[PDB]
Amino acid sequence: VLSEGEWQLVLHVWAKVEADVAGHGQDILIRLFKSHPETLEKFDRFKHLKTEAEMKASEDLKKHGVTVLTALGAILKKKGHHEAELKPLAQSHATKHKIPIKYLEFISEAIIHVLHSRHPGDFGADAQGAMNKALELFRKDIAAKYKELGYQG
Numbered sequence: 039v040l041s042e043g044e045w046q047l048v049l050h051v052w053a054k055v056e057a058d059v060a061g062h063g064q065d066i067l068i069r070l071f072k073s074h075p076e077t078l079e080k081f082d083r084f085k086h087l088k089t090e091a092e093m094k095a096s097e098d099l100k101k102h103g104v105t106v107l108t109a110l111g112a113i114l115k116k117k118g119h120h121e122a123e124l125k126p127l128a129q130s131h132a133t134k135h136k137i138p139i140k141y142l143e144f145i146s147e148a149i150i151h152v153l154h155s156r157h158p159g160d161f162g163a164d165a166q167g168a169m170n171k172a173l174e175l176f177r178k179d180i181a182a183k184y185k186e187l188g189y190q191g
């Protein structure tokens with residue numbers, strides 16, 4: 039489980055992300071798409087983007103980054119008591135968007151990398167370990183909903 043001190047590390051760095059939600063969101067999605075190109079194919083909205091420069095110039099991509107980080111922040115601020123928020127997300131990602139759990143692992147790695155690049159002083163090893171645990175909890179709870187619906191695999 040996460041301890042109170044671990045949650046405090048997570049939420050202290052998250053308060054810094056919220057001073058620039060759009061910029062963080064852009065960086066995280068670009069990192070995902072460049073490191074794991076198969077993920078771009080799940081987005082009919084974005085699959086025309088071929089270069090990093092094109093990704094950086096897209097306002098629609100920046101808008102989706104804000105949607106993703108706003109939803110994640112709402113989950114993290116519940117400190118584990120996130121059923122109401124998480125259940126609808128799991129349902130749409132399993133049955134409509136068809137996102138494998140592995141791609142949730144990939145985006146979690148992208149989040150960690152961008153937080154370390156933008157906030158080294160508040161993102162030392164202790165904070166990294168707490169954020170990894172928070173994102174593991176997120177994935178574990180989505181995976182349990184996927185299995186109920188027959189999408190875990």
Ligand code: HEM
Pocket residue numbers: 077078080081082083105106107109110126127130131135137141142145
């Ligand atoms: C931190 C993880 C993630 C969060 C919090 C998140 C959140 C959201 C939210 C709030 C929406 C809009 C409402 C909905 O459709 O449920 C959405 C849409 C979507 N997400 Fe996720 N997402 C995450 C990861 C991913 C990943 C890894 C992929 C693909 C590789 C993905 C693919 C999509 C798609 C295709 C849509 C629909 C976009 C559109 O065409 O409007 N998501 N996501």
